[PDB]
Design a protein around this ligand. Structure first.
Ligand SMILES: CCCCCCCCCCCCCCCCCC(=O)OC[C@H](COP(=O)([O-])OCC(O)COP(=O)([O-])OC[C@@H](COC(=O)CCCCCCCCCCCCCCCCC)OC(=O)CCCCCCCCCCCCCCCCC)OC(=O)CCCCCCCCCCCCCCCCC
Ligand SMILES: CCCCCCCCCCCCCCCCCC(=O)OC[C@H](COP(=O)([O-])OCC[N+](C)(C)C)OC(=O)CCCCCCCCCCCCCCCCC
Ligand SMILES: CCCCCCCCCCCCCCCCCC(=O)OC[C@H](COP(=O)(O)OCCN)OC(=O)CCCCCCCCCCCCCCCCC
Ligand SMILES: CCCCCCCCCCCCO[C@@H]1O[C@H](CO)[C@@H](O[C@H]2O[C@H](CO)[C@@H](O)[C@H](O)[C@H]2O)[C@H](O)[C@H]1O
Ligand SMILES: CCCCCCCCCCCCO[C@@H]1O[C@H](CO)[C@@H](O[C@H]2O[C@H](CO)[C@@H](O)[C@H](O)[C@H]2O)[C@H](O)[C@H]1O
Ligand SMILES: CCCCCCCCCCCCO[C@@H]1O[C@H](CO)[C@@H](O[C@H]2O[C@H](CO)[C@@H](O)[C@H](O)[C@H]2O)[C@H](O)[C@H]1O
Ligand SMILES: CCCCCCCCCCCCO[C@@H]1O[C@H](CO)[C@@H](O[C@H]2O[C@H](CO)[C@@H](O)[C@H](O)[C@H]2O)[C@H](O)[C@H]1O
Ligand SMILES: CCCCCCCCCCCCO[C@@H]1O[C@H](CO)[C@@H](O[C@H]2O[C@H](CO)[C@@H](O)[C@H](O)[C@H]2O)[C@H](O)[C@H]1O
Ligand SMILES: CCCCCCCCCCCCO[C@@H]1O[C@H](CO)[C@@H](O[C@H]2O[C@H](CO)[C@@H](O)[C@H](O)[C@H]2O)[C@H](O)[C@H]1O
Lengths: 100, 558, 80, 494, 188, 61, 73
């Protein structure tokens, strides 16, 4: 794919976007978990931004029959719109969800 | 050392009748109190809740010796007010080391410096403060009922004599009479309280009473109801002597009536010694098990006095127009804060009490010093206001009305700003020291469940801030009714100063006007050091608050 | 901040405030020696607060160690 | 030393130089006024240096200094994207605030310059401190200089105006102190890094909320508690009016991003309908009574109450857009309210000695430069597009609608009512007939001083309106940290 | 709980407070500057003592009456009694605004004192380890998800994993309509 | 005219390759981890002091 | 302060502006002023607040398409 930029190594998270198994009194590990979650939520919203830019070019390209040519892009944008918001880490940091 | 100083000063004062020698007896009193500081400074080399001395009738604690040092320093600062002339003459030609130490100035200093003012003519004034100080440092160190009573009277009787020492003042004689008469009724309550302790316990020792109280605190023919009843009457006497509401009506009248030099000492030292003694008594009379003994705690009277002192001190002060009546009521609302931290007996509250007491004794000293200096500065000023010609004892209290400070910003800006910084500290405005004191007493009460009292304190702090701001509005928001004396600068009115070298040879002769007269350095430097402490406290707080954290850790330790 | 510097400037600030109260001229040459003197007194009071702080640190450290032995000895005796 | 401490020392150094220059010359007041102005420009150059180096996507506080020595109270300075623009606003206003009031003071000029140079340090500190007790310390250290600024250089009803600001701000801020002391007791420190980790019990949060909101409601201010501002701003000197509206009214706005959004989230969520009910009411009542105000400078002060309510509902939206719009509307209010105060308090009052709208009419005929700028600042007060005020209101209003729709629907009525009073004031002073007959002699138009501070303030309002990304790119990542909530498929990742 | 005889307690409140006011009336007689005699306590200062009994009796009687109706003992009753006590203080002055105003001030303070806890006496002692209690509060950084959803609830941006399936069940029960969003793609 | 000139000069180029000034500006404000290392030390100490303040203030009488 | 230009200050408008400034010193509690005060300060905020509570979290529009309901609750 597109090469990973030099600016995209300095700010790339080194930790998974989670708080499970993170000692809070280790401030270094804690702030990086905060950063990891915020960066993921933001990649998700810019993923929808880019799909929306493609939708627009399919709209101005297909004109009248965009209703039968731009449906795949419409799916992806509507999926992302329901799932990506920047909600922060504060709720995530302060609650644990067992997933069981 | 205080007792060696009293007897030595007494013998010298006994064989003299010269009133010009008063200046030097006050200077030797400062030097004598400095040796007491150096002796008590060496008595801090141990960690002990207390050691009983002289047959168990006295005790020494780190807190006792720390506050013996504090009392001696506060006394030294007040003693300067009678050890140095109020005003000086200064010229740039006599300002170097060679001049101040090897040369000399000659001029008619009598009317400029007020050499024969009333304060500079009482020979036994330095002596009687020493007697008051002695009773103060004994109260702090008393381990017996009898020693308490004898020490409190030693302090009280000398305060009465201080208030009556200006014998030609019909205001000072009245105030001392009021003080002795209402103070004697207070002494009966203290004596009734100790008497009722001994008759029900057979003991005069505080430690035996502490152990009797200790054993009674377990969650039959002899239920110890007497200790909390006896200490309650015993608290009324000391509540009066610190002027906690409702036993407060005397202080505004007495502090207004006696001379301002005197009220500096009278309104500060008594509260320092009484509040220290109460703290140790509150600690060892505590209940560790909530039983029926705890329901009648004597400490409730201090909680009701604090509530009443907060309200009365701030509400009654609103309509005061006399400055010494205002400062009397301001002290009442400040002891409501001191009394609230004493009543909550917690590690945090005890640290807050030690800070509130020391910082307020220092700050209320600056307020008195600024007032005395402002009155000594109107020597080169004239007024035609009609409300000032009708005043009484204008030499004993030169500044009696808040109207007299109108436009002082124009007359002296930094003296005005020093009084501003002091007053805003009484309000509790950050970054000033008085804020951090009230902060610690609000956080202690809140953490222990005294939320209702804390809300009442911050409401009265707004009410009390009203009359503090009214003094500021007078000094800065209006032009001065005081105008420079026209004669002191007529362009023909000059006083000749002569400069003389070591062997009395005229180096120089200078022509000086009223513009070459200034405030004496002892009063300008003292004001400068305390105003800076109030302002720069947030950069110099570690060792002051660390001392209190350590003192309380020893008291609560084990 | 540095205590020696704060106290040295504290003495400098006290001299400045003194002359402002007395309304005297700041910076007269034949009286400039007061600034080193006031600041020098300020520096000295600071070496003393440094000795005070050094000893307070030792004793507050000990106390925190004592409250931890008490809480532990008590905890050990509650294990029975 | 750090670069955030240089921000504080420079205004202190300027105070020293004003105090000592007379000791080297009887010196002119013009020399005192150049010292104070050069000192404020240097603080603005440092602050632009800080902004060049600032990392727009960093979760660690920047330009900090390793203290390594702990006391009971210690100054800890740091900068995050949430605070950088508040610092910049303080450093752009203070130079103009001095220039605006350059001729109008006349007496006690050293004292006036020293108070402003002291205010700049105290207001800079309140954004730079990394503790909540230190925040309170400076959020309330500004009350003694402001009591004396109004009393020494204020208008006729100055004594009552200065008593109102001090006592209301003292009373309101003492309920904040009780809440701060409780959090410190439970956690052991008020340093932000340690406090933000900690999660309070709901009941503690609901009582910490009651006490931070009481403080902020007095200092916003809300409708039934706004009497101090109607007195303070009007009777204040022109320069004090510029500081109090642009910078002091923003201290409560920036204090929600520290004292409420990160540490009391459940309380903020379950109580937002109380906030929005108050915010809606203060949008309507303030606006109805701004229509009938007959003092021009008090018509600018009342307008501020309506705008603060839009940004208060924006900070309580739990939305990224309403939170950034709240900061944008506070920055926008800082420029526009400054200009309208300069027009009312510094041009009309300078030439007439009156603030009554009865006496002004047709001022465009003899003062065409004043009417051009006055129109642009009235349009921004009305939230017209192409000004930063529109962007902040739109984002503040959208997050209000997304949080609780009904209240944002009432709050949206600010579009009709802010427009109503802004044009009505304009048509009555600039337009409304021919030049009044109460003017005996002709009035000069804008001076090169009056023109260039009005032009500077308008320039910031319009350029930032066109490209708000100058401020938006800095807040994004840091705003992301104060949102409370999860999404069912984006959270708890494995 | 154990019912309280409101009338019996009401007399106790009137006598205790009215006794103190009778002592206040007595100071007025002692301090009077004219030869008013001993019977001036019940003629010239009688109103002072009478309103003390009226205020004290109404407070305790209404506090007790409030407790019986609500069948509970808490800080709320100190509010009802304070409102009726302050109302009685306002009746003496005969001014409508103050009848309500004095009731407001009295009710708020007498309830605020009780809900905070009795400060004027010895505060209640939990009798526990303070260090353990304070430290638990500082290190209780994360909580069960169920704990928070109990105080705030799901919704308002709090969409916990599984929110959509639950919302479908919630919406079906209340609206009687099954949620089935449309595709948006003509293909698949 | 100046804005058009300044904007033209300060552009990066066809594909990456920043200019010398761009290299200088990014170099001075590097701070690769020195904000993190200083914040972590300070957070660790102020967290210790909170434990200490609780130990000294909640001690057995 | 600075001298201003000459204004024909109307004694009638000057005393009117003085009247507006000191007006509060004469507010009384009547049956009318209480009725207006109670309506504005209690009733309207309580009505706005009540609707704010009842409709809080009631609706969400994001990504809602046909077949879905706007109502959250
Ligand atoms: C928290 C605490 C932190 C503390 C940090 C440091 C604070 C700042 C430093 C303060 C230094 C003050 C003392 C130095 C001083 O006054 O110098 C100015 C003073 C001359 O400057 P000036 O004010 O222009 O003099 C005007 C005339 O002299 C005419 O002056 P005058 O006749 O009005 O009185 C002259 C002199 C009268 O007193 C003396 O002669 C001083 C005697 C001190 C030793 C005994 O007054 C004073 O010195 C007052 C000092 C008050 C100190 C206590 C304040 C509390 O110096 C002297 O000539 C005094 C003697 C020289 C110093 C010897 C002792 C040094 C150590 C003193 C320790 C106490
Ligand atoms: C705003 C407040 C204004 C207050 C004005 C006074 C400013 C100082 C405030 C009090 C600070 C504490 C003073 C304690 C006494 C001074 C002790 C000291 O500084 O050095 C100790 C020394 C003690 O030294 P020493 O001679 O006893 O033994 C020295 C021991 N070694 C060798 C280890 C150092 O100073 C003294 O001699 C004590 C006598 C002081 C004389 C009176 C001082 C009054 C002040
Ligand atoms: C007399 C006073 C008039 C005052 C108002 C003036 C309004 C127009 C101002 C001039 C506009 C261009 C000059 C802008 C200066 C800043 C330069 C800049 O940022 O880029 C401007 C851009 C030229 O960039 P360019 O050289 O074409 O880059 C690609 C080359 N391969 O060129 C452009 O982007 C052109 C598009 C500008 C906006 C056109 C209108 C869109 C919004 C309506
Ligand atoms: C702002 C004003 C200036 C700062 C004010 C405070 C400065 C002085 C604080 C002194 C108190 C704390 O500092 C310390 O406390 C303990 C308390 O017993 C005492 O310490 C003393 O006993 C211990 C124990 O045997 C000895 O180890 C020590 O050598 C001895 O001096 C001294 O007093 C002081 O060494
Ligand atoms: C905590 C307390 C509150 C702090 C609030 C901030 C207050 C700041 C006040 C500034 C300092 C005082 O400001 C001071 O004003 C006086 C006015 O008499 C000036 O003093 C001079 O003023 C003018 C100058 O031509 C002269 O005519 C006058 O005779 C002379 O006294 C000082 O040169 C100035 O420094
Ligand atoms: C939430 C409730 C409110 C919270 C707290 C707010 C309280 C504010 C109360 C301030 C009361 C006004 O404070 C008081 O105002 C009067 C003006 O009428 C001032 O009085 C002053 O102004 C008058 C105006 O004619 C002049 O004669 C003169 O300058 C002086 O007497 C007092 O110096 C001030 O103390
Ligand atoms: C409309 C405004 C209404 C409120 C205005 C005044 C409130 C200002 C902030 C008050 C903060 C709440 O009060 C604070 O709550 C916490 C717990 O929740 C208390 O913490 C606790 O301390 C003690 C000691 O363990 C406990 O026995 C007790 O359960 C509780 O009081 C604090 O002691 C108290 O200070
Ligand atoms: C206007 C004035 C309103 C009243 C003043 C504010 C009262 C705040 O006081 C409040 O009281 C309740 C009663 O337990 C306590 O609140 C909390 O206390 C402890 C927490 O430590 C919990 O066990 C308790 O469940 C909880 O209610 C706190 O002490 C405080 O949050
Ligand atoms: C942009 C700002 C404003 C946005 C927020 C306001 C949105 C308003 C949405 C109103 C509709 C909400 O969702 C609507 O609720 C109504 C009930 O009230 C229900 O309406 C339903 O009524 C009957 C039962 O009476 C059903 O048989 C029918 O299928 C449907 O019409 C549906 O659940 C839905 O049509």
């Amino acid at each position: 794919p597109t090469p990973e930029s030099e600016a995209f190594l300095a700010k790339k998270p080194q930790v998974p976007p989670t708080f499970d198994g993170v000692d809070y009194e280790d401030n270094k590990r804690l702030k990086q978990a905060q950063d990891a979650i915020i960066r993921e939520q933001w990649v998700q919203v810019m993923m929808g931004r880019l799909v929306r830019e493609e939708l627009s070019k399919c709209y101005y390209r297909e004109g009248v029959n965009h209703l039968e040519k731009c449906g795949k892009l419409r799916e992806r944008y509507l999926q992302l719109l329901a799932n990506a918001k920047v909600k922060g880490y504060l709720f995530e940091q302060q609650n644990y969800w067992s997933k069981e | 050392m205080i007792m060696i100083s009293i007897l030595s000063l007494l013998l010298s004062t006994s064989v003299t009748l010269r009133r010009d020698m008063s200046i030097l007896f006050n200077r030797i009193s400062i030097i004598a109190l400095a040796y007491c500081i150096l002796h008590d400074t060496m008595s801090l080399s141990f960690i002990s809740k207390g050691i009983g001395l002289h047959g168990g009738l006295l005790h020494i604690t780190n807190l006792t010796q720390i506050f013996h040092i504090f009392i001696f320093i506060i006394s030294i600062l007040i003693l300067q007010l009678t050890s140095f002339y109020p005003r000086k003459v200064w010229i740039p030609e006599y300002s170097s080391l060679k001049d101040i130490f090897f040369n000399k100035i000659l001029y008619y200093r009598t009317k400029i410096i007020n050499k024969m003012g009333e304060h500079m003519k009482i020979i036994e004034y330095p002596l009687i403060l020493l007697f008051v100080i002695s009773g103060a440092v004994f109260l702090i160190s008393t381990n017996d009922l009898v020693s308490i009573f004898l020490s409190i009277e030693l302090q009280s009787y000398g305060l009465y004599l201080l208030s009556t020492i200006y014998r030609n003042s019909e205001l000072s004689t009245t105030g001392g009479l009021i003080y002795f008469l209402l103070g004697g009724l207070s002494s009966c309550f203290i004596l009734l309280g100790t008497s009722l302790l001994y008759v029900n316990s057979g003991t005069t020792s505080l430690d035996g009473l502490y152990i009797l109280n200790s054993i009674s605190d377990v969650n039959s023919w002899y239920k110890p109801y007497y200790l909390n009843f006896s200490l309650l009457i015993f608290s009324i006497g000391f509540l009066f002597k610190v002027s906690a509401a409702p036993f407060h009506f005397w202080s505004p009248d007495v502090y207004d009536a006696i001379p301002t030099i005197v009220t500096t000492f009278v309104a500060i030292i008594a509260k320092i010694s009484i509040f220290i003694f109460l703290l140790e008594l509150v600690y060892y009379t505590n209940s560790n098990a909530n039983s029926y003994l705890s329901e009648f705690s004597w400490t409730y009277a201090l909680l009701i006095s604090s509530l009443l002192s907060l309200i009365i001190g701030t509400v009654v002060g609103l309509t005061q127009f006399r400055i010494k009546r205002l400062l009397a009521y301001s002290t009442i609302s400040h002891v409501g804060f001191i009394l609230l931290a004493l009543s909550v007996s917690s590690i945090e509250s005890t640290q807050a009490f030690i800070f509130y007491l020391i910082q307020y004794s220092i700050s209320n000293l600056n307020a008195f010093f600024i007032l005395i200096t402002i009155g000594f500065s109107l020597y080169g000023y004239v007024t035609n206001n009609k409300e000032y010609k009708s005043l009484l004892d204008k030499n004993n209290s030169p500044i009696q009305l808040i109207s007299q400070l109108k436009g002082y910003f124009y007359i002296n800006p930094l003296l005005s700003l020093s009084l501003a910084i002091t007053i805003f500290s009484f309000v509790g405005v950050p970054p000033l020291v008085g804020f951090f004191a009230k902060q610690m007493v609000l956080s202690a009460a809140l953490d222990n469940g005294y939320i209702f009292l804390s809300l009442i304190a911050i409401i009265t702090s707004v009410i009390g801030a009203v009359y503090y701001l009214n003094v500021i509005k007078e000094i800065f928001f209006y032009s001065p009714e005081h105008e420079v004396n026209p004669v002191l600068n007529e362009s023909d009115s000059n006083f000749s100063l002569r400069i003389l070298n070591e062997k009395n040879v005229l180096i120089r002769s200078v022509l000086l006007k009223g513009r070459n007269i200034f405030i004496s350095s002892p009063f300008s430097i003292t004001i400068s050091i305390i105003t800076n402490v109030i302002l720069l406290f947030i950069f110099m707080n570690k060792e002051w608050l660390s001392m209190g954290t350590i003192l309380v850790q020893i008291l609560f330790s084990a | 901040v540095n205590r020696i510097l704060f106290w040295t400037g504290f003495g400098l600030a006290v001299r400045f405030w003194q002359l402002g109260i007395e309304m005297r001229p700041f910076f007269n040459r034949k009286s400039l020696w007061a600034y080193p003197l006031f600041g020098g007194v300020g520096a000295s009071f600071g070496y003393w607060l440094q000795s005070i702080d050094e000893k307070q640190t030792k004793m507050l450290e000990e106390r925190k160690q004592a409250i931890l032995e008490k809480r532990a000895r008590r905890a050990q005796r509650q294990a029975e | 030393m750090s670069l955030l401490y240089v921000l504080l020392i420079i205004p202190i150094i300027g105070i020293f130089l004003i105090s000592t220059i007379d000791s080297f010359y009887f010196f002119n007041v013009s020399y005192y006024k150049k010292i104070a102005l050069i000192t404020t420009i240097l603080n603005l150059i440092v602050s632009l240096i800080i902004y060049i180096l600032f990392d727009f996507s960093n979760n660690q506080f920047q330009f900090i200094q390793e203290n390594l020595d702990l006391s009971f109270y210690d100054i800890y300075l740091g900068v995050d994207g949430v605070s950088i623009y508040f610092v910049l606003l303080t450093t752009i206003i203070m130079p103009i605030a001095l220039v605006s009031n350059w001729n109008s003071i006349t007496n006690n000029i050293k004292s006036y310059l020293i108070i402003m140079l002291l205010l700049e340090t105290l207001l800079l500190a309140v954004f730079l401190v990394l503790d909540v007790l230190l925040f309170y310390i400076f959020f309330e250290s500004i009350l003694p200089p402001l009591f004396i600024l109004i009393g020494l250089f204020g208008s006729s009803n100055k004594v009552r105006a200065s008593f109102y600001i001090f006592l209301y701000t003292l009373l309101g801020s003492l309920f904040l102190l009780l809440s701060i002391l409780t959090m410190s007791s439970i956690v052991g420190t008020t340093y932000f890094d340690v406090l933000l980790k900690s999660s309070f019990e709901y009941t503690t949060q609901l009582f910490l909320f009651f006490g931070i909101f009481i403080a902020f409601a007095v200092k916003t201010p809300v409708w039934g508690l706004n009497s101090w501002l109607l007195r303070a701003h009007v009777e204040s000197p022109l320069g004090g009016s510029i500081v109090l509206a642009a910078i002091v009214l923003k201290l409560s706005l920036y204090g929600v991003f520290r004292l409420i959004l990160p540490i009391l989230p459940q309380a903020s969520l379950n109580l937002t309908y109380i906030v929005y009910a108050i915010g809606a009411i203060t949008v309507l009542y303030a606006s109805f009574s701004t229509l009938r105000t007959v003092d021009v400078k008090e018509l600018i002060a009342y307008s501020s109450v309506a705008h603060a309510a839009i940004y208060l509902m924006g900070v309580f939206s739990n939305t990224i857009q309403g939170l950034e719009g709240a900061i944008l509307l506070g920055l926008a209010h800082g420029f526009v309210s400054s200009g309208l105060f300069i027009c009312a308090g510094g041009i009309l009052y300078d030439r007439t000695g009156t603030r009554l709208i009865y006496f002004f009419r047709g001022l465009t005929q003899i003062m065409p430069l004043f009417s051009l700028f006055f129109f642009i600042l009235c349009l921004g007060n009305a939230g017209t597009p192409l000004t930063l005020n529109f962007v902040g209101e739109f984002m503040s209003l959208y997050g209000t609608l997304e949080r609780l729709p009904i209240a944002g629907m009432l709050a949206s009525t600010s579009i009709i009512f802010s427009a109503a009073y802004s044009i009505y004031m304009y048509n009555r002073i600039a337009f409304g007939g021919s030049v009044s007959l109460y003017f005996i002699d002709c009035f000069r138009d804008l001076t090169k001083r009056e023109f260039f501070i009005l032009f500077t303030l308008v320039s910031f309002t319009v350029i930032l309106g066109i490209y708000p990304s100058f401020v938006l790119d800095g807040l994004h990542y840091n705003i992301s940290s104060v949102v409370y909530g999860i999404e069912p498929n984006a959270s708890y990742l494995t | 709980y154990h019912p309280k005889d409101a009338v019996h307690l009401g007399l106790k409140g009137a006598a205790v407070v009215g006794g103190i006011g009778l002592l206040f009336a007595a100071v007025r007689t002692s301090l009077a500057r004219k030869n008013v005699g001993p019977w001036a306590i019940f003629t010239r200062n009688g109103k002072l003592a009478a309103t003390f009994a009226a205020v004290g009796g109404a407070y305790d009687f209404t506090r007790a009456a409030a407790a019986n109706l609500r069948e509970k003992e808490d800080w709320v009753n100190n509010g009802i009694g304070g409102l009726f006590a302050g109302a009685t203080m306002g009746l003496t002055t005969g001014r409508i605004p103050r009848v309500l105003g004095f009731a407001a001030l009295t009710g708020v303070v007498l309830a605020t004192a009780e809900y905070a806890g009795s400060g004027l006496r010895g505060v209640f002692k939990r009798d526990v380890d303070e260090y353990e209690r304070k430290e638990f509060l500082r290190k209780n950084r994360r909580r069960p998800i169920e704990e928070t959803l109990a105080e705030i609830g799901e919704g308002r941006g709090i969409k916990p994993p599984g929110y959509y399936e639950r919302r479908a069940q919630r919406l079906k029960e209340k609206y009687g309509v099954d949620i089935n969003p449309v595709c948006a793609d003509p293909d698949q | 005219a100046s804005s058009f000139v300044i904007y033209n000069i300060s552009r990066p180029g066809p594909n990456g390759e920043p200019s010398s000034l761009h290299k200088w500006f990014s170099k001075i404000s590097d701070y690769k981890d020195e904000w993190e290392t200083r914040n972590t030390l300070m957070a660790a100490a102020l967290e210790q002091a909170a434990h200490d303040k609780h130990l000294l203030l909640t001690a057995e009488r | 302060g600075l001298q201003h230009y000459k204004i024909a200050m109307d004694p009638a408008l000057v005393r009117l502006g003085s009247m507006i400034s000191n007006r509060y010193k004469y507010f009384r509690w009547t049956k009318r002023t209480a009725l207006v005060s109670f309506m504005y300060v209690v009733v309207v905020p309580s009505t706005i607040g009540y609707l704010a509570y009842k409709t809080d979290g009631l609706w969400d529009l994001r990504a809602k398409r046909r077949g879905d309901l706007i109502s959250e609750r």
